[PDB]
Symmetry: D2
C-alpha cells in the first residue's frame, strides 16, 4: 500500500525481524507528530501503516530502531536508529517502499517510489 | 580531531563537495542543541568540527544536507537530508569518521572508529 | 524459487528494468559454464532461472549487465557489469535472492538466503 | 599512483586489514592476465599497484578476497570474493580509488575518480 518499510540484515543475509519502526509527520508548527508505528514481520516488512486517504502531502520521518535490533542479537552497534526523512505525495499520491540494509556499523537506505 | 565527516557522490564518482553538515548534541531535555557545522571540502571531507576536550560522551546527530546538494546539481532527490545518530563512548576507539555515500534515492552511511 | 535476481536503480528510486543477467556455474575443470540467463521485468526481478533439482551445489556467478543499462539511459557508468560470486547449496538446498542496487559509479549487492 | 583500493568493514566499523587484492587486465583473447596484487594495510588501503606509464586504457578487474577476510574473523560469508570490473579511460580523470564496504552477506563498491 502507500507506505511500506522493509528491513534486511547484512550480517546474516536475512530479513530483520521484529524491528520497531516509528513514523512521524512534520506539523505546520514544525514539530514531529506521531503518524504510525509497528514492527517488521518474519519477512522483514511492515505493511498497513497508512491508507492513501490518510497519507497526505507532508515531510515524513521513518525511524527504524536498529540499535534495539542488534542489542537483542548480542551486538553493540554504532547507530541509535536509522532515520529516513522525505517529502511524500507532493506531486500526487505515490507508493513508497523504504528499504534499509543493516550492519552493526553501517546502514543503507533506499526508496522505491512508484505511481499507482 | 575526534570527529570527521566524509561524503561521496555515487552518481559522479567523486567527493561530494560543498555539502552542508550540521552536528547536534542531545540535551538533557531530549532536544538537539547545535554543536558544530561546516561544508565539505573539495575532497568531500569536513574536519575541525570539535576537539577531544569538548567531544564528551553523549548522543550526537550528524545531519548531512543531501537535498540541497542534489538540487545544486539539477537532480531530483528523495531525502530531505541524511541523519546519523550515535552515542560517543570513551571506552572504545577515539576517532570517529562518519562516511556517507550519496545517490538521489539512496544513501549509505558507515562509521569508521579507530584509536589514533 | 531457488534463485532470483532483483535490481534497483538508486538514481530514480525504481526497479531497474530490462537488465540482462547471465548466470554461470564453475565446472570441475575450473571454467565458467553458462547456467541460465534472462532479463529483469517491469518489477526489476528475474525469476524462473532454475529449479531446485537443477540448482545443485556449486560456485555460481551472477553477472548483471549494468553498463548496458546505464548506456540506454544516456549514462557512461564506471563498471562493465556487476559480478556476484558465491557457493550455493553446500549445506543443502536454499533459496537465494541476489539483490543489486545500482548507481553510475557505485553498486551494492546483497544476498537474502532462506531455508525453504 | 593511478589506482588505489580501499576496503572497510561494516561489522566492526574499521578498515579491513590484510585483505588480499588481485588486479587483472583483460587480454586480447578475452582472458584475465594478472597485473598486480597486494594486501590492504592497517588503514584498509592498498597503494603502489601500478604506475601511470603502465596503467594504459583497457578493461581491468579488481578481485577482493572477501571470503578469506571473513573466515579469518570467524564469520560465515556469502561471496567467494568481490569483483570490480571497469574500463580505464585516458580522456577522464586519472586517479582511480576503488572502495569497498564489506558485510558478510553484502558489499558495496564505489569508484572515486579524480584529476590530481
Ligand atoms: O562504498 C560505500 O558503499 C560506502 C558506504 C557508506 C559509507 C561510505 C562509503 N564509502 C567510503 C567510506 C569511507 Cl570512510 C572512505 O574513506 O575515506 O576517508 C571511502 Cl574512500 C569510501
Ligand atoms: O541490494 C542491495 O545491496 C541493497 C541496497 C540497499 C538497500 C537494500 C538492499 N537490498 C534489497 C534486497 C531486497 Cl530482497 C529488496 O526487496 O525485495 O523484495 C530491496 Cl527493496 C533491497
Amino acid at each position: 500500500c502507500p507506505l511500506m518499510v522493509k528491513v534486511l540484515d547484512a550480517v546474516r543475509g536475512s530479513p530483520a525481524i521484529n524491528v520497531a519502526v516509528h513514523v512521524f509527520r512534520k506539523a505546520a508548527d514544525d514539530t514531529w507528530e506521531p503518524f504510525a508505528s509497528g514492527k517488521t514481520s518474519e519477512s522483514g516488512e511492515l505493511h498497513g501503516l497508512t491508507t492513501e486517504e490518510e497519507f497526505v502531502e507532508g515531510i515524513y520521518k521513518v525511524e527504524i530502531d536498529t540499535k534495539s535490533y542488534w542489542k537483542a542479537l548480542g551486538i553493540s552497534p554504532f547507530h541509535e536508529h536509522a532515520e529516513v526523512v522525505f517529502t511524500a505525495n507532493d506531486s500526487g499520491p505515490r507508493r513508497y517502499t523504504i528499504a534499509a540494509l543493516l550492519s552493526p556499523y553501517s546502514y543503507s537506505t533506499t526508496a522505491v517510489v512508484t505511481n499507482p
